[PDB]
Amino acid sequence: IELLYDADADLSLIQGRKVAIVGYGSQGHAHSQNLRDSGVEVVIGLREGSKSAEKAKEAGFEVKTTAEAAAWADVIMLLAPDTSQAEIFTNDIEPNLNAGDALLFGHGLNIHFDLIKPADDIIVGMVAPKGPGHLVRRQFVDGKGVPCLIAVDQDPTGTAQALTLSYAAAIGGARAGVIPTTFEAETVTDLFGEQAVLCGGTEELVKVGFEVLTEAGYEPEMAYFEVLHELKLIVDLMFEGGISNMNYSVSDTAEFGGYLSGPRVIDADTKSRMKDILTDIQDGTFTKRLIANVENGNTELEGLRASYNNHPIEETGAKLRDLMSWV
Amino acid sequence: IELLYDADADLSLIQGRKVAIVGYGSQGHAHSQNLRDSGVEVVIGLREGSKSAEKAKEAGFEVKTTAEAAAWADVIMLLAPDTSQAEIFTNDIEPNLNAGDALLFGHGLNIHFDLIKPADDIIVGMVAPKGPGHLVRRQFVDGKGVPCLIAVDQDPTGTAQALTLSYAAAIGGARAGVIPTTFEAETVTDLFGEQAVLCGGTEELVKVGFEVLTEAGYEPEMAYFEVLHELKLIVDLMFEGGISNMNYSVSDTAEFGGYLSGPRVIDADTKSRMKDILTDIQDGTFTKRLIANVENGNTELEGLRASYNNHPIEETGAKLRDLMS
Ligand SMILES: [Mg+2]
Ligand SMILES: [Mg+2]
Ligand SMILES: [Mg+2]
Ligand SMILES: [Mg+2]
Ligand SMILES: [Mg+2]
Ligand SMILES: [Mg+2]
Ligand SMILES: [Mg+2]
Ligand SMILES: [Mg+2]
Ligand SMILES: [Mg+2]
Known part of the structure; x- marks a missing residue:
């Protein structure tokens, strides 16, 4: 363009x-x-x-x-x-x-x-x-x-x-x-990018990844490292050279694993759910909810924030990060 | 610990x-x-x-x-x-x-x-x-x-x-x-990290987000920015504080959007599919496929890589990055 x-x-x-x-x-x-x-x-x-x-x-x-x-x-x-x-x-x-x-x-x-x-x-x-x-x-x-x-x-x-x-x-x-x-x-x-990928999709991907490991008996701190902390390297590499660049710079084990398992997590039905997210933005459903929330005093957002950031990955992430700023 | x-x-x-x-x-x-x-x-x-x-x-x-x-x-x-x-x-x-x-x-x-x-x-x-x-x-x-x-x-x-x-x-x-x-x-x-979240999950999520916008008639470059280029600032935020640092620093529309729609993208079925991926690692099935790849000349990995790399997101991003920081 x-x-x-x-x-x-x-x-x-x-x-x-x-x-x-x-x-x-x-x-x-x-x-x-x-x-x-x-x-x-x-x-x-x-x-x-x-x-x-x-x-x-x-x-x-x-x-x-x-x-x-x-x-x-x-x-x-x-x-x-x-x-x-x-x-x-x-x-x-x-x-x-x-x-x-x-x-x-x-x-x-x-x-x-x-x-x-x-x-x-x-x-x-x-x-x-x-x-x-x-x-x-x-x-x-x-x-x-x-x-x-x-x-x-x-x-x-x-x-x-x-x-x-x-x-x-x-x-x-x-x-x-x-x-x-x-x-x-x-x-x-x-709005799509934020809902489907950047804010909503990413944050829930890492939360749920953290939950699967934690529910399987692995320690939260291990989980925070392999699911959120290492995400910055991956995303820096994608920012610099796209997906091809990330895949080049990780081990072949990570790369091969990425290819087999990524489209198991993000499968065809996921893609349809994203399409429905998009329709909802295009027809004003989302914006209806957005204004409803403001006109009701911002209660829904404050309630969502309060519980959605009340997650063990946030309790565990803060302990470890506080320990790493301490050098 | x-x-x-x-x-x-x-x-x-x-x-x-x-x-x-x-x-x-x-x-x-x-x-x-x-x-x-x-x-x-x-x-x-x-x-x-x-x-x-x-x-x-x-x-x-x-x-x-x-x-x-x-x-x-x-x-x-x-x-x-x-x-x-x-x-x-x-x-x-x-x-x-x-x-x-x-x-x-x-x-x-x-x-x-x-x-x-x-x-x-x-x-x-x-x-x-x-x-x-x-x-x-x-x-x-x-x-x-x-x-x-x-x-x-x-x-x-x-x-x-x-x-x-x-x-x-x-x-x-x-x-x-x-x-x-x-x-x-x-x-x-x-392994589960790389597969479910870091390499596998993130790359398919951005890739599939991109497709959704291109098929609905939005130009590939708009889609690139709003699905991938902006991902770094978000993940940088999570790296520094947490998820709540990210939610504190984005607009109230962005935060509200993520709460309402993230769980539609990552539902309880997703959670189960992740448990499945876990189970394939724990019981050794991922390992056998890794060994098989390399006993047959690394072509499976080479083909999967090629499939990813000739995805329009790769063409489009390359164009857009050339206008660099
Ligand atoms: Mg790792
Ligand atoms: Mg000796
Ligand atoms: Mg390699
Ligand atoms: Mg590794
Ligand atoms: Mg007007
Ligand atoms: Mg944005
Ligand atoms: Mg705010
Ligand atoms: Mg005037
Ligand atoms: Mg915005």
């Missing part, structure tokens, strides 16, 4: 725009500094009566409220928690928007699932780098960058493509490569 | 031994160099006209035939590949093992499944570092170490635990913590 670099982007565009970053978390923090270094006048939008308000002042940024910053700005980047964002839009952002203002996102959930429905004459786009804030910043500071996806949901003027590229270009994403995509595509691929 | 440290180990024990390292690959080169800086007389034992003989000589080691090295030595650490070990023991090691000599391994496979049966009066132990050769080497140089397992299958002398711990100290493991175990427990946990 497509790749855009500095030569393709027009930095003079976002340079000529007042930008408001609503949020000063990991992303907010990196964007703000990189934009500033790229020549962009930036203001942080916050509750102005906040921890962050003073951290942002101390990093050199003018700080206003969410409502005042939205009013002040031409481009509004909304980097608040996915679930706070509807309330923040309705109350503090929507009421201060001019026609021609751009409203930009790090993630497409609120737009794709219609939790935020801006007026037609507003630009809606997305800049989502592929790394956490600190890396986006560090890569930028030493003349490199982190690759970004970009997307446009509302393009009333016909300048949204160039405005989201210009932004990604200012945060260093055009150094590595900017990938145009869609709000739909970004959103469902991300 | 005791962790053992430098204060527990008598380093003079392995310092007073002649150590043969049979095999000079990953662990071989590192064990070898670490022992030497811990004051141990080391020799490398390689097959007739081996490629690794040049590497070992250039690194300062007396290199011998396996059989000459086995004869010279008191302690013989066997780090050739698992499927090569039985034959090497019968041809070149077994004939020079004398009362009070010790045979060491870095994995319990051959001893536990009775591929190698030493005589009564030989010490049989293991020192398995929890990390890759190069990491075992560099950690030791920078004053640190990689944790080690140790075990003892045979102990005619009463010195076998002290001897293994001495060796572990000499390669840096006691700096980081040495866990006592058994041959059975290290063998089976390692």
